[PDB]
Every structure is written in structure tokens, then in C-alpha cells.
Design a protein around this ligand. Structure first.
Ligand code: NAG
Ligand code: NAG
Ligand code: NAG
Ligand code: NAG
Ligand code: NAG
Ligand code: NAG
Ligand code: NAG
Ligand code: NAG
Ligand code: NAG
Ligand code: NAG
Lengths: 413, 148, 231, 327, 49
């Protein structure tokens, strides 16, 4: 199969790699039961404006993000970096919620990249958007005109704003180099423009309560995560693990490391996760990969026999007749104490061949016969006859010249 | 015996076959065929798929060209060695050991071959030796005598 | 005022990742080697208004309880936020309560300007705080978009010529990671001899070697000399 | 300014000849690489690690997992063949005689020593002691493996001893055809008669030749001493292979344009409609890095093949006979 | 006369010319000017381009 042919020659051919599949699944998460209260979040009456944000850095909880799926109609979920339906298994470090009542079709300007007026001098997000944006139609609660002065809106600033930076300002703008000194003269006003509302207003004129809560996926100990369960922890068994979002395979043995109280994860020379700390009671583990290897088939040839010999490269015959060489565990041959010329190279000086029933035998390479030329103080060996021999050498001198066509191979008709 | 000549032929055949088969592997598109992509999708969406396909095919062609250059360098080294052997063995006797065949070189007859050359080196090989007592020199009535 | 050196001190663990026998290099905010340090004798009221440009490397040499305050704040007049930190025997009094600021930073606790609405508090039990070896206490600080990291390590120091930053590598492990959103751009110490070794931080690539015990033994700054640049 | 050398001035004249009056036998040394470190990568493990879905998405990609393995296997076979075209040119393995009275010389540091269990010579012992979680175990868990050579150290030692026992007992006869026993004082005389010196100089100054040869062997024993810059051509290839394997396990932690560097985090944070957009850039970058490594290994194997052909020519001309080629 | 001496020079010249000319060749993009792509199209897709 690996080489497409129904008649293989005599030699060693690499086919695949020995690998042990897992037989279990570990999803141990930090034991916590409190739920994040949603009363102090968007699901509330008193809302804020873009002038004064509502940033609530929540603590550890087991709040399931699949709760607002029955919110008000037209609940957009534009997650630029994560997936909406996938917010049920990842363990985030800290969530930074926000709240504002931006009005109009400028809801697309809240997303990163857009450079609208709201994105210029009313709000700004870094170019990562580690969370999602939650925006819905807010008209039944903001229909009255009493909320006009309660929903503020800043004006243009002489300098661009900073991502995650509040823009609370109460002074008067100064155009050029002419200070108006508080009193609004020409080209100088207060950046406190109040949004005008109307009960029977247009569709696009209705405000939208937008939530832009974000996360941070890094090595810090996670606090918030989705509601899942936990299982037991095996040691000498190659299984699957989902320790604090870190998904992978391999054995999880006990490590004799010296993890400091602030060091949770652990990497290797190649920046690969080699050890992790259990979210439960403090225990140092060692993430070692599953027992793998490489196989090699010794075939005497298609039309000479039908027997083969497997060579598990990098195995000590205790990880898979049986022969342990310095190159693997040859299973399917027998080691004879004789010596012949190498026919099928294997490694470490132990070749194989198909000799006499008829079975595949293994033997140490024979460098040749042993001759002992006597050396005396006076002994010459002058030949008395000649044997003219004609040998032959095979040397390439050229190669088939080829030419390719870009407009016919890279692109068809 | 005739494996050095078949080696380059089989290598080129396998390279050409792999390069042809590379046209039947989706590099991240919906299909290997290009017309079905340009017919079942609009230009802006199908643009990403056709760019992935053209990038994969260009990378495969560049890999083929690099392998061909390395093989051509190897075959140039082999051809220079063959020319040196033909110029030092056929066009005159050479006192280099193992160069013009194993043994004392006497002649070399070149012959044509598909994408190669097959030499016929004539070597002098002694046989039927006998042991004899030897000496550095013999002593005369007062002078020495070494073999000329 | 005076100026002491910063030979091979000011290195801390950038990330929370255990590594054994590696050579890692990150573009974090370390302390430049062989830099000036504003040596202030607070024995004598040495109470400057030193800024907080991209961090600080506050250190202290005392006997028992001389220096016990690192109040922060930017516009400390009547309304700005701050970070009060005392090191009493019980626990820390970490606060972010915006309140009044008295010009006299003298301390027991005697400042007590005003109490009002707060935003965050912390009563963490792991407080931040041989005979001849009095104390070699240094406190690294940094303001990030998230939590306010604080690095420190209390080590013994031998007696020698008039107090200066000694020679010897010592990594700084973190102690608290309290979340905060303050806009502090100044500095102020509290006390009721002293070092007051303030050192400003700035971005610089630092190749740091990790031992097989998970401890930093030495670190290059990659900016000092062309030899380090080659290293 | 670089010094090109000393400033000699030969005195040319119509009648002036310089004829030597004394010989100074000297033994030099040359270092020639022969083999390399055979390697083998795992496509379904270096590209995709514990990421079965990644394997299912890589199967759609072109047949790049079968040409690189074939190139590495060809390189391994070529490296295993270079150790046979150099160290193996004589079929019959010769054996040194029991007694050690070869003329007046002291061939005791080049001949194998039966005392130590390695069956090597003091020179070989000095050579095999200067050419070198651990890094080897770390690279193994990411596809990069190191296959062992075919001919081990004992077989190469026996081959070198066979090429040496036939050079002392016989002259250039065992190279051409059958071995012919010839005394060493006569073999050296016939070798001196091949440069122009008549054989009336060795038989009259045999003890001086033996002493000079012994002193040359002694000085060679100290030339390969603790001095580091001696076996530089043998450690260069090892350091290059090491820096090549380290540059390939470092590429697995580089973002080729994705939101992360783990194949298990993109498939646990994004959705399938968007997963095939950020998981393919990393696969493409890793395939390009592996192709670059394979091309570098091919160029290195070509250089090593050229060096092995040169070493075989040296073994054939200089060892198996006498060559009249200057330098 | 100097065929093999001019051959390497011409090869190096051609290689340098190709390497310096492929900078004004759109590798599947809107344009080839870095600033124009960074500023005149959009921030988000500028990364992809
Ligand atoms: C709860 O989690 C903490 C976190 O370290 C751990 O120390 C404690 O043992 C856990 N308790 C139970 C009952 O799992
Ligand atoms: C294989 O196992 C045996 C017994 O434990 C041990 O003596 C030997 O060194 C092992 N070989 C390898 C290559 O691990
Ligand atoms: C030498 O060998 C040839 C054949 O190789 C044989 O015919 C002859 O009898 C041998 N002896 C001589 C020529 O003295
Ligand atoms: C820094 O320290 C040196 C040495 O103490 C001093 O000469 C210099 O004035 C200080 N200040 C600056 C800005 O270099
Ligand atoms: C923090 O304080 C500095 C000090 O002037 C100020 O320039 C900056 O705008 C403030 N905010 C941020 C986010 O840095
Ligand atoms: C390193 O760790 C080992 C672990 O057993 C310990 O024995 C040794 O003392 C440690 N060395 C240092 C310098 O910390
Ligand atoms: C001898 O050598 C000189 C050079 O010094 C030359 O001028 C002269 O012609 C030579 N005479 C003969 C006879 O070669
Ligand atoms: C020739 O030179 C060697 C130097 O090794 C010396 O031992 C020997 O005595 C010299 N012989 C004559 C004849 O000058
Ligand atoms: C003959 O040779 C042997 C060994 O090569 C040696 O021991 C012996 O002394 C020699 N005898 C003579 C007379 O040279
Ligand atoms: C050869 O040299 C070694 C140097 O250690 C010496 O021990 C040995 O006796 C010498 N052999 C002869 C035959 O001179």
C-alpha cells in the first residue's frame, strides 16, 4: 500500500509508525460552585453611556455562557477571535465586561478595524478582540425622552484615543491656539453632546445596548470557565486530558520537579507543554507523550516467498522469534550464530536474508574471510603466472532533459 | 549490474509521476478541478480557493525544480568523473590504483549506453605465487651488490 | 542625592512557566544593567515626588521597620486614586480608595486623611515583608493593562563599605497580582538610615538562563555592549 | 595586514644545482569526512501533534509526506554506502602476525590493541574521545529521530586493521590482486625507488629511518592531543546537524499567521467554518520548514558524498599503493 | 575566452535582479506598496494581505 505496486522487491521499506491510542478522557476542572451574578451586568435597568464605562472585572465562577441565548430579539454575536458556540469548554483567566448605550447604525464601528467617530473619540478596542460583542435592539426601555440627557456622547478630540482607556472629560475644546475660556465662542464647545431620542423614531435611529466583554487566554490561572465535570486521575496510563483547557494526549505520570508556588504550567526546550499543575489539590505532574515508535518490514521479495519480518525501531522488546538489536526489536526472524554476506541491511551490523524449510534468518555481517599472510625476515612471494581479467564500470553521463509549462500545469484550460 | 543507469531514469519517472499526481490533491479548496470552482462559486469567494490551489501547485513545481537541480549537480559530478576516467584510462595507461579497474591497468575500451557509459577495463592480475628466500643484497669479495 | 550602580540586579520571572536548562528571551520591562539609581538618604526627610515611568525598582536597607510604605497616585491632591500598602505584623492593607492626600507622608498609622467610597480592598495574609545580615529587600513594580504585579525577594546581605547595591544575581519572584485600573504616574514612600534605591524601567530584550532547579542564574541585557549584543 | 609568508630569494645561475645531503622523514595527517548522521522525520507527528483532526485535514494536502521520507531514506542509504566504498575495498580480512619485528619500526600505535575491549589503536582511542530532559529525548517526541549506521565501530576498526595488516606484510600487491608476502625493509626500499632515491640509501641508513619514523609517530600522537583545533572537520558536520535539528524543533513555536501555536487550541476555540482558515497557515509553514530542512540535508549529503569519493580515492591511491601526485 | 568566469557573474547578476524585482510583484494581493495596504484599504484585512 505505501508503495503502489503488487510486486515489491527485496529490501526494507518504511510503512507507518507504531502508536498507541488512548482509552479514556480526563476533564478535571477547578472545583468551584458559585455562579456569576448577572444582576450587575447588562441584564439590568440602570445602564451607562460611552462617557462613563461600566467595567466589572468579575471573579471566579462557573457561569455558563449559553444563558443569554433567550435574550431579546436580534442578539448579534460577532466573536472576532473565538467561537460563539464554543464558549462552553474553554477556561478564561479574567473577563472584562463593559456597558454602553451607543445609538445608531454605528454598531459596526464598535468592532475592531472600523475607524468611525465612535471608534475615534468615543470608544476603542485593541486589535485582538479576545471576547465577543453582544448588541440588541433597545427601544421598549429607551422610548421615553427622559433618557436623552442620561445617555451622553463625546465629541471630537485633538488626539486619537487609546484602546481600553476611559475618556471622561469635562473641559472645553480649544481649536488651534485661541482659548475660548469656558464660554463657548467659535469652534469651541463642550464634548457632552446629548443624544436625541423619540418614541416613534426611525429603525436606524433606535439605540442599542452593546456589551463588548473580552477575555485573556494565557498561562495565568483561569478563574471563570464553563460548567463541566471531573473524573479520576490515572498515572501509568496513556489517556486523554483536558486540564484547564489544555487538550492533548499522552501519559500523565508523577513528576519530581520543583514547581514554584506561582508557576502553574511548564514547557520544554521546544516550547511544548511537558508538565502541568492539577486544578485540584496541588500536585506536580509530567505530561509525557504516548508510547510511539516506528515500524519497518523486512521482505525477501514478492515472487520468492510470502513471509515478512517487522522491525519496531526504537523499542526494547518490552513496549510493543524475538531479537533485540541496537536498532529495534526484530519480530519474525531468528538469529543464527553463523556469518554470511549482507543481503538485506537492517542496522547495527545485523543483516537478514531468505535462506534454508525456508525462513527469514538474522546474522551478523561478514566482512570477509580471514587470511594470515606470513611475514618473515626473508620471504618473498613472486608470482609465476598471469590471469588477464576484464571488469566493467557503470557511470551515468547525462539525464533526460525536461521542460514544464506554467500556463498549462499550474493553470488548466 | 545495470542499476546506475536505471536509477536516474526511475528517479525522473517518479518525479514526473508525483508532479502529475499533485494536480489531484486539494490544497484546502472544495475540489481539485478549477472550472467547477469557477462555476459553482462567485469570484470573490472562489478567489481564496483558487489562490490556495495556485500556491500549492507553484510550491510543488518549485520543489520539483529544486530536486531536478540537485540531481543535475550530482549527475554533473558523475559525468566529470566519467570524463576523467575516459581521458586517463582509454586515452593512455594510468598508474592509479583501482581507478582503471581493480588491478594493474592495461587497457580501457569505452562503449555507449543509455544515459551513461560502460567501460571495459583490462587489468593485470598475478596468480600462482610461490614462496622464495630473499635478501636485500649479496656480498662479493669486498664490495656490495644491490638489485638494479 | 546620590547615584549607586545596578550591576546585575533587576531580573524577574516574566511569565508563569517552569523551564529547566533553557535560554529564553522576551521583550518585557526589565531594569537596564549598569544604570543610575537615585540614592536617597531618608534618615532627615527625603520625600521626593519621583515619577513612575514604566515601572520602578524600589529597594530598601533597614534594621526592623524603618520603611513600611509605598503609597502611589498620580494627581494626589483631593480626588485621584491611589494604592496604600503598609506591612504591619497582621497583614497587608492594600487599598485603591480614592481619598484626600496629605502633603506630609509621615506615619504607627497617622496619615488617615479621609475615608469614603472605595472600589477594591485586599487583606491578603501573605504580607510583603543572623544579626550581621540586616536585610537586602527590593520591590519591583509595574503598571500593566490588567493586574498590578509586585515582585520582591528578602535576602541576607553582608556588611561592607557605605550602603550600595551589591554585586550578585538574584531573580525576583512575584508575590501579589491584585487587579487594578489605576492611572498612577508618580511615587511616594512612608516611614515613621535608608536606601530608597529608585530605578526606572524601560523595554529591553533580556536573555535569561534558567537552571535545572527553576531558578535564574544569570541574564544578558543585549544592549550594554557589543559583546552582550553578540551573546 | 595579512602576512602571505616569509621572503625567500632563490639564487638562479647558469651553473648552480642544489642536491640534498640528508633526509627527514615526516608523517603528516589529513581529516576527511566520510559519513553523516542519518535522520528520519514523522510527517503525521511533526506537523500534527496529538491533533487527529489535523491529520484528517492534512490528508487532503498534496503527497508531501511521502517524498520527504523517500529523500531521507535515499540520504540514509547513500550515507550507509559511503562507509563501504572507503573502509571496504579488500575482500579478505587480513591479520597481523603475532611477533612485532617489522624491520626496526614500532607499529604499535596504529595496530589494534588487544588489551582494551574495543580492539582499536591508541591513535583511534585518542580520536574517538574528542568527537562527540536531554535534547535527544526531546527531539524524538516530535518526529526527529536518528537511525543507527549499518557498520558499527568494531567493524570499521576491523576494516582499518585489515587495510593496515596488508600494508605492512604485503606492499601494493594485496590492493591489485592476491597478497604477496614481502619483507618491510625491502618494501620501503621499493617505495624509495619510486621517488628517485636508489635503494643504496635505506639499507645503509635503516636505523636512522626507523628512529625518524618512530619520532614522527610520537609527534603525531601529540598533534591530536588536547589541542581543540585538530578534529575540526569531523565536529563541523555534527554541529551543523545539531543546529539544523534545533532550528526545526524551534519552528513549532512560531505563529505563521494564526491566533496561536497549538493544533489543539485552534480546534477548541474556533469553529470548523473558521478553523480551516487558521489551522492551514501553520500546516503550510511547517511543511515549508520541513522542505527547507530536507533541501539542506540533500545539499549536505551531496557535499558528504563528494568528500567520501575523495576519501575513497585517497584510500585507493595513497594506502593501496604509491601515488606520484604532488600534495 | 572567459566563459566560465563571466557565467558565474551573469548568474549572480540575474539572481540579484530577480530578487530585487520580485518586490514589485503582487503575491496575490491588492497592491505591492506596504503603506497603501496598511492604510488605504482597512486595518483588519491588512494583516492577511
Ligand atoms: C478545591 O480547589 C482547591 C484549589 O487548589 C483545592 O486546594 C481544594 O483541595 C479543592 N477541594 C476539593 C474538595 O476538591
Ligand atoms: C532493555 O531492558 C533491559 C532490561 O530492563 C536493559 O538491561 C536494557 O539496557 C534495555 N535496553 C534499552 C535499549 O533500553
Ligand atoms: C598459467 O595459466 C594458464 C591459464 O590461466 C594455464 O593455461 C597455464 O598452464 C598456466 N601456467 C603457465 C603458463 O606456466
Ligand atoms: C549617572 O551616574 C554617573 C556616575 O555616578 C554620574 O556621573 C552622572 O551625572 C549620573 N547622571 C547621568 C544623567 O548620567
Ligand atoms: C495614564 O496617565 C498618563 C500620565 O499623563 C496619561 O498620559 C495617560 O493618558 C493615562 N492613561 C493611560 C491609559 O495611559
Ligand atoms: C537542584 O535540584 C536538585 C534536586 O534534587 C537538588 O538536589 C539540588 O540541590 C538543586 N541545586 C540547586 C543549586 O538548587
Ligand atoms: C650567465 O648568467 C648571466 C646572468 O647573471 C647571463 O647574463 C649570461 O648570459 C650567462 N652566461 C651563460 C654562458 O649562460
Ligand atoms: C639527518 O637529520 C636527522 C634529523 O632527524 C639527524 O638525526 C641525522 O643525524 C642527520 N644525518 C646526517 C647524515 O646529517
Ligand atoms: C625473524 O623475525 C622475527 C619476527 O619478525 C624476529 O623475532 C626474529 O628476531 C627475526 N630473526 C632474524 C634473524 O632476523
Ligand atoms: C613503541 O613505543 C612505545 C611508546 O610508549 C614503547 O612503549 C614501546 O616499547 C615501543 N616499542 C618498540 C618495539 O620500540
Amino acid at each position: 500500500c505505501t508503495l503502489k505496486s503488487f510486486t515489491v522487491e527485496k529490501g526494507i521499506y518504511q510503512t507507518s509508525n507504531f502508536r498507541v491510542q488512548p482509552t479514556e478522557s480526563i476533564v478535571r476542572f477547578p472545583n468551584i460552585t458559585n455562579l456569576c451574578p448577572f444582576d450587575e451586568v447588562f441584564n439590568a435597568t440602570r445602564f451607562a453611556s460611552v462617557y462613563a464605562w461600566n467595567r466589572k472585572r468579575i471573579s471566579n465562577c462557573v457561569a455558563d455562557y449559553s444563558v443569554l441565548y433567550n435574550l431579546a430579539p436580534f442578539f448579534t454575536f460577532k466573536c472576532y477571535g473565538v467561537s460563539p458556540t464554543k464558549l462552553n469548554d474553554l477556561c478564561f483567566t479574567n473577563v472584562y465586561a463593559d456597558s454602553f448605550v451607543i445609538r445608531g447604525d454605528e454598531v459596526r464601528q464598535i468592532a475592531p478595524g472600523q475607524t468611525g467617530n465612535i471608534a475615534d473619540y468615543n470608544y476603542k478596542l485593541p486589535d485582538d478582540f479576545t471576547g465577543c460583542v453582544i448588541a440588541w435592539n433597545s427601544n421598549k426601555l429607551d422610548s421615553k425622552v427622559s433618557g436623552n440627557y442620561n445617555y451622553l456622547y463625546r465629541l471630537f478630540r485633538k488626539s486619537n484615543l487609546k484602546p481600553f482607556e476611559r475618556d471622561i472629560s469635562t473641559e472645553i475644546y480649544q481649536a488651534g491656539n485661541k482659548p475660548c475660556n469656558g464660554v463657548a465662542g467659535f469652534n469651541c464647545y463642550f464634548p457632552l453632546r446629548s443624544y436625541s431620542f423619540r418614541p416613534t423614531y426611525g429603525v436606524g435611529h433606535q439605540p442599542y445596548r452593546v456589551v463588548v466583554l473580552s477575555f485573556e487566554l494565557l498561562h495565568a490561572p483561569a478563574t471563570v470557565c464553563g460548567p463541566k465535570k471531573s473524573t479520576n486521575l490515572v498515572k501509568n496510563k496513556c489517556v486523554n486530558f483536558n486540564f484547564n483547557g489544555l487538550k492533548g494526549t499522552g501519559v500523565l505520570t508523577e513528576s519530581n520537579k520543583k514547581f514554584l508556588p506561582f508557576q502553574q504550567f511548564g514547557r520544554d526546550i521546544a516550547d511544548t507543554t511537558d508538565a502541568v499543575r492539577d486544578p485540584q489539590t496541588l500536585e506536580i505532574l509530567d505530561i509525557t507523550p504516548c508510547s510511539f515508535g516506528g515500524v519497518s518490514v523486512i521482505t525477501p521479495g514478492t515472487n520468492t516467498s510470502n513471509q515478512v519480518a517487522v522491525l519496531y525501531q526504537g523499542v526494547n522488546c518490552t513496549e510493543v522469534n524475538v531479537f533485540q538489536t541496537r536498532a529495534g526489536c526484530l519480530i519474525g526472524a531468528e538469529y543464527v550464530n553463523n556469518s554470511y554476506e549482507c543481503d538485506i541491511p537492517i542496522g547495527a551490523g545485523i543483516c537478514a536474508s531468505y535462506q534454508t524449510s525456508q525462513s527469514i534468518i538474522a546474522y551478523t555481517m561478514s566482512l570477509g574471510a580471514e587470511n594470515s599472510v606470513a611475514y618473515s625476515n626473508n620471504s618473498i612471494a613472486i608470482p609465476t603466472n598471469f590471469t588477464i581479467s576484464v571488469t566493467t564500470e557503470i557511470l551515468p553521463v547525462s539525464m533526460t532533459k525536461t521542460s514544464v509549462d506554467c500556463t498549462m500545469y499550474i493553470c488548466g484550460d | 549490474a545495470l542499476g546506475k543507469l536505471q536509477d536516474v531514469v526511475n528517479h525522473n519517472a517518479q518525479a514526473l509521476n508525483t508532479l502529475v499526481k499533485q494536480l489531484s490533491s486539494k490544497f484546502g479548496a472544495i475540489s481539485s478541478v478549477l472550472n467547477d470552482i469557477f462555476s459553482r462559486l462567485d469570484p470573490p469567494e472562489a478567489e481564496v480557493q483558487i489562490d490556495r490551489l495556485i500556491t500549492g501547485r507553484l510550491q510543488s513545481l518549485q520543489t520539483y525544480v529544486t530536486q531536478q537541480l540537485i540531481r543535475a549537480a550530482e549527475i554533473r559530478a558523475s559525468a566529470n568523473l566519467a570524463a576523467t576516467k575516459m581521458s586517463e584510462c582509454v586515452l593512455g595507461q594510468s598508474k592509479r590504483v583501482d581507478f582503471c579497474g581493480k588491478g594493474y591497468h592495461l587497457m580501457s575500451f569505452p562503449q555507449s549506453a543509455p544515459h551513461g557509459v560502460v567501460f571495459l577495463h583490462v587489468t593485470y592480475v598475478p596468480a600462482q605465487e610461490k614462496n622464495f628466500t630473499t635478501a636485500p643484497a649479496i656480498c662479493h669479495d669486498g664490495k656490495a651488490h644491490f638489485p638494479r | 542625592p546620590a547615584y549607586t550602580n545596578s550591576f546585575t540586579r533587576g531580573v524577574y520571572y516574566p511569565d508563569k512557566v517552569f523551564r529547566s536548562s533553557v535560554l529564553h528571551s522576551t521583550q518585557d520591562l526589565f531594569l537596564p544593567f549598569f544604570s543610575n539609581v537615585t540614592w536617597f538618604h531618608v534618615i532627615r526627610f527625603d520625600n521626593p515626588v519621583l515619577p513612575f515611568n514604566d515601572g520602578v525598582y524600589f529597594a530598601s536597607i533597614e534594621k526592623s521597620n524603618i520603611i513600611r510604605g509605598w503609597i502611589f497616585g498620580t494627581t494626589l491632591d483631593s480626588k485621584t486614586q491611589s494604592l496604600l500598602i503598609v506591612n504591619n505584623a497582621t497583614n497587608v492593607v492594600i487599598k485603591v480608595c480614592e481619598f484626600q492626600f496629605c502633603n506630609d507622608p509621615f506615619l504607627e498609622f497617622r496619615v488617615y486623611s479621609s475615608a469614603n467610597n472605595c472600589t477594591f480592598e485586599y487583606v491578603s495574609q501573605p504580607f510583603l515583608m543572623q544579626g550581621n545580615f540586616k536585610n537586602l529587600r527590593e520591590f519591583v513594580f509595574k503598571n500593566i493593562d490588567g493586574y498590578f504585579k509586585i515582585y520582591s525577594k528578602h535576602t541576607p546581605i553582608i556588611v561592607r563599605e557605605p550602603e550600595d547595591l551589591p554585586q550578585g544575581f538574584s531573580a525576583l519572584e512575584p508575590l501579589v497580582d491584585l487587579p487594578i485600573g489605576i492611572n498612577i504616574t508618580r511615587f511616594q514612600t512612608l516611614l515613621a538610615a535608608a536606601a530608597y534605591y529608585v530605578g526606572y524601567l524601560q523595554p529591553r530584550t533580556f536573555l535569561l538562563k534558567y537552571n535545572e532547579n527553576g531558578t535564574i542564574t544569570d541574564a544578558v541585557d543585549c544592549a550594554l555592549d557589543p559583546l552582550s549584543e553578540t551573546k | 595586514t595579512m602576512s602571505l609568508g616569509a621572503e625567500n630569494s632563490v639564487a638562479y645561475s647558469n651553473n648552480s644545482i642544489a642536491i640534498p645531503t640528508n633526509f627527514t622523514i615526516s608523517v603528516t595527517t589529513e581529516i576527511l569526512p566520510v559519513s553523516m548522521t542519518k535522520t528520519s522525520v514523522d510527517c503525521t507527528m511533526y506537523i500534527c501533534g496529538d491533533s487527529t483532526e489535523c491529520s484528517n485535514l492534512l490528508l487532503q494536502y498534496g503527497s508531501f509526506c511521502t517524498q520527504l521520507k523517500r529523500a531521507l531514506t535515499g540520504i540514509a542509504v547513500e550515507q550507509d554506502k559511503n562507509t563501504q566504498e572507503v573502509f571496504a575495498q579488500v575482500k579478505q580480512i587480513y591479520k597481523t602476525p603475532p611477533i612485532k619485528y617489522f624491520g626496526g619500526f614500532n607499529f604499535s600505535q596504529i595496530l589494534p590493541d588487544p588489551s582494551k575491549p574495543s580492539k582499536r589503536s591508541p591513535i583511534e582511542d585518542l580520536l574517538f574521545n574528542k568527537v562527540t530532559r536531554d535534547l535527544i529525548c526531546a527531539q524524538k517526541f516530535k518526529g526527529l529521530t536518528v537511525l543507527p549506521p549499518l557498520l558499527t565501530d568494531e567493524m570499521i576498526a576491523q576494516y582499518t586493521s585489515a587495510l593496515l595488516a596488508g600494508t605492512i606484510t604485503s606492499g601494493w600487491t594485496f590492493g591489485a590482486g592476491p597478497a604477496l608476502q614481502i619483507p618491510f625493509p625491502m618494501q620501503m626500499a621499493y617505495r624509495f625507488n619510486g621517488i628517485g632515491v636508489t635503494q643504496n640509501v635505506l639499507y645503509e641508513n635503516q636505523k636512522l629511518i626507523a628512529n625518524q619514523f618512530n619520532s614522527a609517530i610520537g609527534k603525531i600522537q601529540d598533534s591530536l592531543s588536547s589541542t581543540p583545533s585538530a578534529l575540526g572537520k569531523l565536529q563541523d558536520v555534527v554541529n551543523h546537524n545539531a543546529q539544523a535539528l534545533n532550528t526545526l524543533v524551534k519552528q513549532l513555536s512560531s505563529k505563521f499567521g494564526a491566533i496561536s501555536s497549538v493544533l489543539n487550541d485552534i480546534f477548541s476555540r474556533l469553529d470548523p467554518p473558521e478553523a480551516e482558515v487558521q489551522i492551514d497557515r501553520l500546516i503550510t509553514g511547517r511543511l515549508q520548514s520541513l522542505q527547507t530542512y530536507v533541501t539542506q540535508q540533500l545539499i549536505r549529503a551531496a557535499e558528504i558524498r563528494a568528500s567520501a569519493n575523495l576519501a575513497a580515492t585517497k584510500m585507493s591511491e595513497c594506502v593501496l599503493g604509491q601515488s606520484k601526485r604532488v600534495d
